[PDB]
Write a protein that binds this DNA or RNA. Structure first.
Ligand SMILES: [Mg+2]
Ligand SMILES: [Mg+2]
Ligand SMILES: [Mg+2]
Ligand SMILES: [Mg+2]
Ligand SMILES: [Mg+2]
Ligand SMILES: [Mg+2]
Ligand SMILES: [Mg+2]
Ligand SMILES: [Mg+2]
Ligand SMILES: [Mg+2]
Ligand SMILES: [Mg+2]
Ligand SMILES: [Mg+2]
Ligand SMILES: [Mg+2]
Ligand SMILES: [Mg+2]
Ligand SMILES: [Mg+2]
Ligand SMILES: [Mg+2]
Ligand SMILES: [Mg+2]
Ligand SMILES: [Mg+2]
Ligand SMILES: [Mg+2]
Ligand SMILES: [Mg+2]
Ligand SMILES: [Mg+2]
Ligand SMILES: [Mg+2]
Ligand SMILES: [Mg+2]
Ligand SMILES: [Mg+2]
Ligand SMILES: [Mg+2]
Ligand SMILES: [Mg+2]
Ligand SMILES: [Mg+2]
Ligand SMILES: [Mg+2]
Ligand SMILES: [Mg+2]
Ligand SMILES: [Mg+2]
Ligand SMILES: [Mg+2]
Ligand SMILES: [Mg+2]
Ligand SMILES: [Mg+2]
Ligand SMILES: [Mg+2]
Ligand SMILES: [Mg+2]
Ligand SMILES: [Mg+2]
Ligand SMILES: [Mg+2]
Ligand SMILES: [Mg+2]
Ligand SMILES: [Mg+2]
Ligand SMILES: [Mg+2]
Ligand SMILES: [Mg+2]
Ligand SMILES: [Mg+2]
Ligand SMILES: [Mg+2]
Ligand SMILES: [Zn+2]
Lengths: 53, 137, 97
RNA sequence: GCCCGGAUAGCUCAGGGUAGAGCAGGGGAUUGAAAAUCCCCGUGUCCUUGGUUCGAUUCCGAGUCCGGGCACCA
RNA sequence: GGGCCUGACUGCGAGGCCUGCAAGCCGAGCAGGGGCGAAAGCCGGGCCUAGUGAACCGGUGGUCCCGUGUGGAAGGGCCAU
RNA sequence: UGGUGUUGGCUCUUGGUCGCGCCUGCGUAGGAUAGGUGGGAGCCUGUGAACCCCCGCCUCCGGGUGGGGGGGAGGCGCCGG
RNA sequence: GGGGGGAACCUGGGGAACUGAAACAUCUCAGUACCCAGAGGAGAGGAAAGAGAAAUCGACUCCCUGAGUAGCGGCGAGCGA
C-alpha cells in the first residue's frame, strides 16, 4: 500500500454489510469499485460497492 | 396603526398561547374589516431554509375551507416560514379548527427526514387585516 | 494554615496525579499516569474578628464555617460575659459548639 | 482522527446583479544611459461537479488539491 | 491479442512440506452462490521464490451473545477490518 | 497565570444572548430606495389628510424614516402599461 | 484532674527505599520499616441511612470455609475481596 494505492472494503449493496476488503490504486481507478460478489448474509451474488475503510 | 386595529389589539395578549379552539372563537372578534376576511395560518418550520431535500411543499384538501372548495398548495419560503389560507372569517368556529388542524396535519406529513429542531418552532392564526395569536399546534 | 477553630478541619494529604493521553470515552487509547506525588490540601482558613461584650475576639476559621461564628455570637446574648478577658470569652463561645 | 479555512489573469491579490486592482509582458510618449514617471492594451467555467434564483465567483450539497489549527499514536 | 467476466469467492478441508516454539508453505475433495466454455473442464488472484510485524491497548461496520433486584441503558463479547 | 472563596458600597462605559417595540433592503425596465414569500379591493383622517417650521437620524445623494409646532379634507392602492 | 514510665500487642496522625518488574517511569516492595500522638490489660469495632437477590439475612469482633474465586492489572510483574 501507499497513499495512492489504498485499502478499501466492499459492502453488499443489498444488506449494507462490508464483506470483503481489498486494495486499489486511486489514481488508476478514481471511481468507486463495483463488483459482483457473494454476500454470505443474503446467500447470493450481489453487486458490492467500494466503501472507505 | 389605525384606531380600528389598535382596538383589536386589546382582545389578544402575546404571552398567552391559546388553543385551536380558543383562536377560532377570536377570529370573528378579529375580523373587523369591510369584507369576509380570510384567516391564514403562519408557521415557522424549524428546518434549514437555504437547501432542498428538506423543502416543505405540497397540498391539503381542507374538509370545509376557502369558501371563495379545498386543495390549497403551500410552500415554505426562503426563510423558515410557511403560510396558507384556512378559510374566510365567516365559517362557524367549529369549522375553522377543523381546517387549522387539518392543515397543520399536512405540514407534519411533509416534514423532511433530515430536519433538526422542533419543526413547528411556532404557529399563529390571524385574519387578513387583524392581529395574530400563537397556538398550541 | 492549620485548623478550623469551629469545624476542626485541618490539612489533609492528597496525591497530585499527572496523566497523559486521550480517555477511552473520547475514543482514545486511554490515560497513562506520568506521575503521582503527595501534596497537601489546606482548609480555606481566614480571620474573623467579632466584638462581644465590647471586647474583640478573633477566630481562625475555614471560610465555610464563617456564619457559624456569627451564630455563636448570637447565642452568646444570654450569657453572663461582661468583665471577662478575650481569652475566656472565646473559651465560653466555643463551649457552645 | 477532528475543527477552521484559501483556489478569482503570467505572479500576488480584494469582491446575491460586475468582473476587476498592483507590478510583470507589449505598444507609444520621454531619455546620452538605467530608471522613475505618463497614456493605451491584453492575461478568465472566479478549483470540480451538482443544486437555488429570472439569473451568480457570491447562497447551499458534494468532491479534488494545496494552506492553517488541535489532538492522538497500540 | 481479443470476447465474456470478478473465483483477488463464502462455509470447510483429507493429506502433507518445513519446523525447538510460534509461524511459514502446498493442497485434492464436499456444500453454497457464481464466471467462462459446445464440452472435457478450469477459476479460493498474479510463472515462482522478497514486497513484512506476534501480543497488548484502542478505532470503525456488523451480530444481538452477556447486561450486577427487574425492564432498558452504560459497558463488554463474537464476526469483519 | 485564568476561574473561584476570603470579597464589600457607589458610579460611568461596553459586548453576548433572549423577549418585545420600531426602522434599515437602491443591478437593471420603471411613477422610484421593490428584502422573501403569503393574504388581499380596500385602507388611512375629528383617535386630524395636503403641503409647511425644528428635524432622531439613515443615505446608494435621488430619497428613506420619525417624534413634534403650523394644519382643516384629501391622500394611497386594485386598475395598468 | 493532667504530666512520666511500660517487652511485645493496639488504634490514630504521618510515612520511605533497597527490591520485584531479569533495564524503567505507572505498578511492586507497602501503608511495610520508621517517626509521632494516644490507650490499656488489652486496643480497635459495634446495635444498620448494612448486606444484596434470597419474596432473604439481622450489632461488632475472631477462627475455618467460600478462594487464589470474583475481580484488579505498563491485562506486565504481580495484586486480591
Ligand atoms: Mg481479502
Ligand atoms: Mg487492485
Ligand atoms: Mg453469517
Ligand atoms: Mg493534580
Ligand atoms: Mg492505565
Ligand atoms: Mg460556602
Ligand atoms: Mg472530517
Ligand atoms: Mg493565482
Ligand atoms: Mg481476457
Ligand atoms: Mg464472491
Ligand atoms: Mg493439516
Ligand atoms: Mg510447525
Ligand atoms: Mg453454460
Ligand atoms: Mg461444470
Ligand atoms: Mg479448488
Ligand atoms: Mg504490555
Ligand atoms: Mg481489543
Ligand atoms: Mg439479552
Ligand atoms: Mg435480556
Ligand atoms: Mg443495579
Ligand atoms: Mg439491570
Ligand atoms: Mg420498561
Ligand atoms: Mg452495545
Ligand atoms: Mg458491539
Ligand atoms: Mg493560582
Ligand atoms: Mg474574587
Ligand atoms: Mg501514661
Ligand atoms: Mg504514656
Ligand atoms: Mg496509621
Ligand atoms: Mg502507623
Ligand atoms: Mg519523605
Ligand atoms: Mg522503586
Ligand atoms: Mg530503584
Ligand atoms: Mg529491576
Ligand atoms: Mg533485575
Ligand atoms: Mg538499573
Ligand atoms: Mg500499597
Ligand atoms: Mg481478655
Ligand atoms: Mg468505640
Ligand atoms: Mg440507633
Ligand atoms: Mg499489583
Ligand atoms: Mg497493596
Ligand atoms: Zn448482503
Amino acid at each position: 500500500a501507499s497513499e495512492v494505492r489504498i485499502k478499501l472494503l466492499l459492502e453488499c449493496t443489498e444488506c449494507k454489510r462490508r464483506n470483503y476488503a481489498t486494495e486499489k490504486n486511486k489514481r488508476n481507478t478514481p471511481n468507486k469499485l463495483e463488483l459482483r460478489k457473494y454476500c454470505p448474509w443474503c446467500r447470493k451474488h450481489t453487486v458490492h460497492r467500494e466503501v472507505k475503510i | 396603526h389605525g384606531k380600528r386595529y389598535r382596538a383589536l389589539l386589546e382582545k389578544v395578549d402575546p404571552n398567552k398561547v391559546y388553543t385551536i379552539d380558543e383562536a377560532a372563537r377570536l377570529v370573528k372578534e378579529l375580523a373587523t374589516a369591510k369584507f369576509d376576511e380570510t384567516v391564514e395560518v403562519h408557521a415557522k418550520l424549524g428546518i434549514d431554509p437555504r437547501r432542498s431535500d428538506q423543502n416543505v411543499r405540497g397540498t391539503v384538501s381542507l374538509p370545509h375551507g376557502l369558501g371563495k372548495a379545498g386543495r390549497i398548495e403551500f410552500r415554505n419560503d426562503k426563510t423558515g416560514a410557511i403560510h396558507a389560507p384556512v378559510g374566510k372569517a365567516s365559517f362557524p368556529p367549529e369549522k375553522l379548527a377543523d381546517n387549522i388542524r387539518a392543515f397543520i396535519r399536512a405540514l407534519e406529513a411533509h416534514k423532511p427526514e433530515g430536519a433538526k429542531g422542533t419543526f413547528l418552532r411556532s404557529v399563529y392564526v390571524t385574519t387578513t387585516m387583524g392581529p395574530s395569536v400563537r397556538i398550541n399546534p | 494554615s492549620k485548623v478550623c477553630e469551629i469545624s476542626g478541619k485541618r490539612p489533609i494529604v492528597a496525591n497530585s496525579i499527572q496523566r497523559r493521553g486521550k480517555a477511552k470515552r473520547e475514543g482514545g487509547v486511554g490515560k497513562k499516569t506520568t506521575g503521582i506525588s503527595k501534596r497537601r490540601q489546606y482548609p480555606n482558613l481566614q480571620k474573623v474578628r467579632v466584638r462581644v461584650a465590647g471586647q474583640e475576639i478573633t477566630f481562625r476559621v475555614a471560610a465555610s464555617h464563617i456564619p457559624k461564628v456569627y451564630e455563636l455570637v448570637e447565642r452568646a446574648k444570654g450569657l453572663k460575659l461582661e468583665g471577662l478577658s478575650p481569652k475566656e470569652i472565646k473559651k465560653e463561645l466555643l463551649k457552645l459548639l
